[PDB]
RNA sequence: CCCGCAGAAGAAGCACCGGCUAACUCCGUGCCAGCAGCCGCGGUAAUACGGAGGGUGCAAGCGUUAAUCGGAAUUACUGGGCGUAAAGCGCACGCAGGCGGUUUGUUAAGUCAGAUGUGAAAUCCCCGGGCUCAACCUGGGAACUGCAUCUGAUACUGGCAA
RNA sequence: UAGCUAGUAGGUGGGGUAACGGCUCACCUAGGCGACGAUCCCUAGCUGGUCUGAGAGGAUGACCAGCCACACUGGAACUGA
């Protein structure tokens, strides 16, 4: 407030962070990926949640989820990352893309198939 | 880029007669209208505001045979026009060729006047037009061509014509398949249904 | 401590009409006597005075239809901390021009409405609803 | 001349040694469509119980409101507790473009197209409260002639 | 008429040459309240005719060094 | 070197040409002093065709601007008398 | 681009369906497997998970991801605040700076009016026109909110006197 | 990031530049910029525009058009309008 206030010093617009440090405001990208491993979520839920610490090509090392039932990630195996909060395992902010590279679509899937990426019957 | 479904079971999710399946036969009374739109058709819907306005909206479009995307772009059109956005959206639809071939009486359905378009049948003035979407502009003369005149289809289809109520606006020979469409359509001359209203309030959010 | 003396009179004016009080004296001066007499000419006040030689106090006299106040609301536009000088085509119209905008264009201080048909813009002093 | 219709119905608890007792509160608003508007608030046991308690209030709560056609005279704000409200006359194009609970006032009333926006909390309550306010406040040039003793068309023109 | 500008000196030791500062009173773009800017010019002049402290008129002219592009008109109220 | 020829706009194999004063270094579609009309290849007999404002002309080739093979031949075109 | 041929023949998916948000049942599973944009679903009668049927919405596209603005009056100049929600420096003095009672002057810096030059073309916008229609191309208009100079106006603000 | 700055800031005279100029010299004076942000640091081609917005603004500057910059990295000149 106050006009001669604002000529002295004008509005600071809050510069928001972004939520998933990917950088160059890239939509995936490719992780070596190390320790394949089960987490245990937040309060009211209870669970063994499948994740990945992945080992991003850029530098960074970040865990991403494995949606799905089942999977074929162990050890390396080359996979794709993609944005997108789980909101309950605290810490990963990523999902790893059914289809694309080293994982593998999700075995016998019929509705909702893009998502998992599993291919016609 | 068409439906190409069930067709009657349009009719019935909207509740009134679309004209979709009107065809030879004047009323269907054949598909348990109204109370029937799958199978959980006894369920009686709340309908928030939101729902209304996309019944609606889905209802001009199944009646003319539209999608969205091309549905979305008369809406703009209507907007940049002159006048009222609720009248220029259904005038902007009442003008496709298509639509005007079948209210000349050249197609029992929307669809049979849509083919007979697309099937190098329809021609206004003195030139063939195969576009369904075609905007026929005031003072057209809109015909069918000498080597598909007096085919099996449009005979019939044109006796049913005399039952409908026939627009103002345009004008039939008859005689020799020969139309003529002169003014644009007014508000007042048809429907007295279709709420317009509904479809600019679902666009402007 | 008394940077404007514009907006002092306009408080005068408001807060009397709150009150529902009659008439409201204050310090007289040049570009007082102009509002004022505006304010009076289309007919928000009920006549005035400037009674004094050495020290002249002006003051109004407040105008009330019903129980309700004439003044609706009456604010400071153009204020000493921020000068707001509109151009010709630019000039507002106050509650859709039912209410007035007093303006000191070049030709003496007048309202919005004779500033758009004399040709010339100036300092929007005060909106009048 | 009826044209009644629901802005919001919302359940509520009182807590007592027992348990935690639900009713229910509903909020309508009524008017002619020409120049009439009555929001009445309404609270009961059950739900349809308390559209009817709502409705009646609201039939008996009802302002004067002095429009041009089927719009405003100027643009109107209308504060209250914590819901701004504002809205513009516009032309005899378009229709209402305002929020629900907003425009459910609007429309009964008999407002055929108007801008408008709630700025501030958004409480169904407070914003018909803060229309109702302001199109009671909406003075018309009749009125503005009348009580400088000038002119209508002096004014107007 | 020759393009001149007013403005008041700020300083004078320089040797045929002489400092001067042009406030322009144009408002802010954003929040419209009116600033008091400046501009300070190199300006050339015969002999120390002008001192510090007083209202002087520049003309637009030949680049007759690095800087000091402008040049003395003549003076208008000297130095109180 | 001012020179008066054609810009080529228009969609791919619809050409619409506007001829235009310009400078030979300058590229086709690039820098120019003041377009002066236009020229349609595929317009046919209709209500427009072909448009050259003459008055323009004798601005530049009265000074000293050459004409290309083309606009030379819409000047010839166009006519002085038919 | 036209005309003859043959025969529906060669030509439909993929999201979603607890609320926000248009659309519901049944089996399988039993805080497991999994879902999740926000709230939240699953602990043996799940509308939320998986399948099936049924629907809804788009359809040669559809969704997911990332990126900008919007909604956000959530940096508020138009248009927010600071007793208790985030927020009056512990309280003074004070230069630079921002603002300044009142009446005469007088300039014309601001301000206002006019006028000329310019603000490339495209783009945007409106009325046309041309491609079977559209996108696309395209004629003319308006506009380019500006900046410069030049003439005036003195109410206001500034300056300089008194 | 609070002081930076010695051809630095100005003069007289000579040279040089298509052209004027610390452009460059020799001497002379002691400046000049700086809180209306110099200096230093990080980032960045710029505009017509684009997208967004009720508008103010916010973001952006792929394609078409103007200007600048650069050509394996670091230098220098020759030729020529
Ligand atoms: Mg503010
Ligand atoms: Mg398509
Ligand atoms: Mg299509
Ligand atoms: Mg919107
Ligand atoms: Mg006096
Ligand atoms: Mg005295
Ligand atoms: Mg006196
Ligand atoms: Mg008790
Ligand atoms: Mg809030
Ligand atoms: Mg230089
Ligand atoms: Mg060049
Ligand atoms: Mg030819
Ligand atoms: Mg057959
Ligand atoms: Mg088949
Ligand atoms: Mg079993
Ligand atoms: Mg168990
Ligand atoms: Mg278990
Ligand atoms: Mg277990
Ligand atoms: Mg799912
Ligand atoms: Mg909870
Ligand atoms: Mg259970
Ligand atoms: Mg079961
Ligand atoms: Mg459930
Ligand atoms: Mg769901
Ligand atoms: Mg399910
Ligand atoms: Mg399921
Ligand atoms: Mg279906
Ligand atoms: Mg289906
Ligand atoms: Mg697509
Ligand atoms: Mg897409
Ligand atoms: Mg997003
Ligand atoms: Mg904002
Ligand atoms: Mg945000
Ligand atoms: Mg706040
Ligand atoms: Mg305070
Ligand atoms: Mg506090
Ligand atoms: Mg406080
Ligand atoms: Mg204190
Ligand atoms: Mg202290
Ligand atoms: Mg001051
Ligand atoms: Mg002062
Ligand atoms: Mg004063
Ligand atoms: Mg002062
Ligand atoms: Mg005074
Ligand atoms: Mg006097
Ligand atoms: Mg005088
Ligand atoms: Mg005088
Ligand atoms: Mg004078
Ligand atoms: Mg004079
Ligand atoms: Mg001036
Ligand atoms: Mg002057
Ligand atoms: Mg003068
Ligand atoms: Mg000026
Ligand atoms: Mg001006
Ligand atoms: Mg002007
Ligand atoms: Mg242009
Ligand atoms: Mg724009
Ligand atoms: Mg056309
Ligand atoms: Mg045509
Ligand atoms: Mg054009
Ligand atoms: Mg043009
Ligand atoms: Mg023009
Ligand atoms: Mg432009
Ligand atoms: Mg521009
Ligand atoms: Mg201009
Ligand atoms: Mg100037
Ligand atoms: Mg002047
Ligand atoms: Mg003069
Ligand atoms: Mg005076
Ligand atoms: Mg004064
Ligand atoms: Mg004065
Ligand atoms: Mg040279
Ligand atoms: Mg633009
Ligand atoms: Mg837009
Ligand atoms: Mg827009
Ligand atoms: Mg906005
Ligand atoms: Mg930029
Ligand atoms: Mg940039
Ligand atoms: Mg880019
Ligand atoms: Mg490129
Ligand atoms: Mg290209
Ligand atoms: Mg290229
Ligand atoms: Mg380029
Ligand atoms: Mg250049
Ligand atoms: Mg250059
Ligand atoms: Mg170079
Ligand atoms: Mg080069
Ligand atoms: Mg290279
Ligand atoms: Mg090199
Ligand atoms: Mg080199
Ligand atoms: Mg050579
Ligand atoms: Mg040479
Ligand atoms: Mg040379």
């Not at chain 2, 729902?51 to 809406?75: A, D, P, S």
């Not at chain 4, 608003?29 to 508007?37: E, Q």
């Not at chain 4, 909390?121 to 040039?141: F, K, Q, Y």
């Amino acid at each position: 407030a106050t006009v001669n206030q604002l000529v002295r010093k004008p509005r600071a617009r809050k510069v928001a962070k972004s939520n998933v440090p990917a950088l160059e405001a890239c939509p995936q990208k490719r992780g070596v990926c190390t320790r394949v491993y089960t987490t245990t979520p937040k309060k009211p839920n209870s669970a063994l949640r499948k994740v990945c610490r992945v080992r991003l090509t850029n530098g960074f090392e970040v865990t991403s989820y494995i949606g799905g039932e089942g999977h074929n990630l162990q050890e390396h195996s080359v996979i794709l990352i993609r944005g997108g909060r789980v909101k309950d395992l605290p810490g990963v902010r990523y999902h790893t893309v059914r289809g694309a590279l080293d994982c593998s679509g999700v075995k016998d899937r019929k509705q909702a198939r893009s998502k998992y990426g599993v291919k016609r019957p | 880029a068409r439906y190409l479904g069930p067709k009657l079971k349009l009719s019935r999710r909207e509740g009134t007669d679309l004209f979709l399946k009107s065809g030879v036969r004047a009323i269907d009374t054949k598909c348990k209208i109204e109370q029937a739109p799958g199978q959980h058709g006894a369920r009686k819907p709340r309908l928030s505001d939101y729902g209304v306005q996309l019944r609606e909206k889905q209802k001009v479009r199944r009646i003319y045979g539209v999608l969205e995307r091309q549905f979305r772009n008369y809406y703009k059109e209507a907007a940049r026009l002159k006048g009222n956005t609720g009248e220029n959206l259904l005038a902007l639809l009442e003008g496709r060729l298509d639509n005007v071939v079948y209210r000349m009486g050249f197609g029992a359905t929307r669809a049979e006047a849509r083919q007979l378009v697309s099937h190098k049948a329809i021609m206004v003035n003195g030139r063939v037009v195969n576009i369904a979407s075609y905007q026929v502009s005031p003072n057209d003369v809109v015909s069918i061509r000498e080597k598909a005149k007096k085919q099996s289809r449009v005979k019939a289809a044109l006796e049913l014509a005399e039952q409908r109520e026939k627009p103002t606006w345009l004008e039939v020979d008859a005689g020799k398949m020969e139309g003529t469409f002169k003014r644009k359509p007014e508000r007042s001359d048809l429907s007295a249904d279709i709420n317009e209203h509904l479809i600019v309030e679902l666009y402007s959010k | 401590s008394m940077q404007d003396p514009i907006a002092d009179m306009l408080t005068r004016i408001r807060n009397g009409q709150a009150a529902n009080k009659a008439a409201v004296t204050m310090p007289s001066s040049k570009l007082k006597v102009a509002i004022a007499n505006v304010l009076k000419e289309e007919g928000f006040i009920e006549d005035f005075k400037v009674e004094g030689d050495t020290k002249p106090e002006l003051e109004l006299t407040l105008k009330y239809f019903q129980g309700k106040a004439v003044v609706e609301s009456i604010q400071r536009v153009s204020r000493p901390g921020l000068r707001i000088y509109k151009r010709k085509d630019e000039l507002p119209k106050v509650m859709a021009g039912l209410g007035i905008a007093v303006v000191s264009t070049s030709k003496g201080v007048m309202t919005d409405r004779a500033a758009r048909q004399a040709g010339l813009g100036g300092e929007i002093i005060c909106y009048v609803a | 001349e009826l044209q009644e219709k629901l802005i919001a119905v919302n359940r509520v608890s009182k807590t007592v040694k027992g348990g935690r007792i639900f009713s229910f509160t509903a909020l309508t608003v009524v008017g002619d469509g020409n120049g009439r508007v009555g929001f009445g608030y309404g609270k009961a046991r059950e739900v349809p119980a308390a559209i009817q308690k709502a409705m009646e209030k609201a039939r008996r709560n009802m302002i004067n409101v002095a429009l041009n056609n089927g719009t405003l005279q100027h643009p109107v704000k209308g504060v209250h507790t914590g819901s701004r409200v504002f809205m513009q006359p516009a032309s005899e194009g378009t229709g209402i473009i305002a929020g629900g609970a907003m425009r459910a006032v609007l429309e009964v009333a008999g407002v055929h197209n108007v801008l408008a926006k709630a700025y501030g909390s958004t409480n169904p309550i407070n914003v018909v409260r803060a229309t109702i306010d302001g199109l009671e406040n909406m003075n018309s040039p009749e009125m503005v002639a009348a009580k400088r003793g000038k002119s209508v068309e002096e004014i107007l023109g | 008429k020759i393009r001149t500008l007013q403005g008041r000196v700020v300083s004078d030791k320089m040797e045929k040459s002489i400092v001067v500062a042009i406030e322009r009173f144009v408002k802010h773009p954003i929040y419209g309240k009116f600033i008091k800017r400046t501009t300070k010019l190199h300006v050339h002049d015969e002999n120390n005719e002008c001192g510090i402290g007083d209202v002087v008129e520049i003309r637009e002219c030949r680049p007759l060094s690095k800087t000091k592009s402008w040049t003395l008109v003549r003076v208008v109220e000297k130095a109180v | 070197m001012v020179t008066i020829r054609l810009a080529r706009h228009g969609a791919k194999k619809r050409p619409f040409y506007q001829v235009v004063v310009a400078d030979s270094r300058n590229a086709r579609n690039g820098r120019f002093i003041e377009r002066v009309g236009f020229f349609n290849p595929i317009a046919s007999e209709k209500e427009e065709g072909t448009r050259l404002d003459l008055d323009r002309i004798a601005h530049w080739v009265g000074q000293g601007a050459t004409i290309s093979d083309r606009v030379a031949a819409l000047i010839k075109e166009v006519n002085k008398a038919a």
